[PDB]
Design a protein around this ligand. Structure first.
Ligand SMILES: [Ca+2]
Length: 279
């Protein structure tokens, strides 16, 4: 029917300002006038998804691929539901399908990484992230995620090189600086991690995990009083943390050993400028 359309075009009229309830109804209206328009069942799925309901989004994604099984846009948003639900297993294969029909699509590829990254099988996540950048090398998010899927493998020298770029593309990401630090802190480097953790806090100073990794930097250096200060902050921020305490206790009672190292050394130095000669 062509009256369906006036309804569908009511659904999409609301879609494109919000009230997805309204769109659900007007779709559900249109769907009775023509339960053979994919664009209706699709955009029915596309409402339900957007609110939070996915089981029903899948139902009304399957039934829209019964009609037209010939659009990535249908397969792409189809894999998501699952990803966004949890079942990455499936989202993948469902994705691949959309990459057979519509290969050249950063968003399709990227998410495949996101899928494989999320599966724990990073080796393979790289491949797709590569493709995604290869098509579209302006997605800050890829270089981040890529720098991420090297970090987890153990190639920091690589993962630094990749974060590096991301930072260029979007220097406006707090939760990037933190890894860029962490990358340094894993190897034999603890200074640059501070210059960079410092930044992460310049951007988001109510991130505690930063304040605490920043603390960590100084304990490996041995500035324990300054380290504490950063764990101090990170405790007002997370009072229930388990090892908020243990670590902060370790930090206090570290300094201890130091001051007493100063003592016993200063008091060996007072038993050999008058009970020894030169050597
Ligand atoms: Ca494998």
């Amino acid at each position: 029917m062509g009256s369906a359309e006036a309804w569908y075009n009511l659904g999409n009229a609301y879609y494109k300002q919000g009230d997805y309830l309204k769109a659900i109804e007007y779709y559900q209206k249109a769907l009775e006038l023509d339960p053979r328009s994919a664009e209706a069942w699709y955009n029915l799925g596309n409402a339900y998804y957007k609110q939070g309901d996915y089981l029903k989004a899948i139902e009304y994604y399957q039934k829209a691929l019964e009609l037209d099984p010939r659009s990535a846009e249908a397969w792409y948003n189809l894999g998501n539901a699952y990803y966004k639900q949890g079942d990455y297993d499936e989202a993948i294969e469902y994705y691949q399908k959309a990459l057979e029909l519509d290969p050249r699509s950063a968003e399709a590829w990227y998410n495949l990484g996101n899928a494989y990254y999320k599966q724990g099988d990073y080796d393979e996540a790289i491949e797709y992230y590569q493709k995604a950048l290869e098509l579209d090398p302006r997605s800050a998010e890829a270089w981040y995620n890529l720098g991420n899927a090297y970090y987890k493998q153990g190639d920091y020298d690589e993962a630094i090189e990749y974060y590096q770029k991301a930072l260029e593309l979007d220097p406006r990401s707090a939760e990037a600086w933190y890894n860029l630090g962490n990358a340094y802190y894993k190897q034999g480097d603890y200074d640059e991690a501070i210059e960079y953790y410092q930044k992460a806090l310049e951007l988001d100073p109510r991130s505690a995990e930063a304040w605490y990794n920043l603390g960590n930097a100084y304990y490996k250096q041995g500035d324990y009083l300054k380290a504490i200060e950063y764990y101090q902050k990170a405790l007002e921020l997370d009072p229930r943390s388990a090892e908020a305490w243990y670590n902060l206790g370790n930090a206090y009672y570290k300094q201890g050993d130091y001051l007493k190292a100063i003592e016993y050394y200063q008091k060996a130095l007072e038993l050999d400028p008058r009970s020894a000669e030169a050597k």
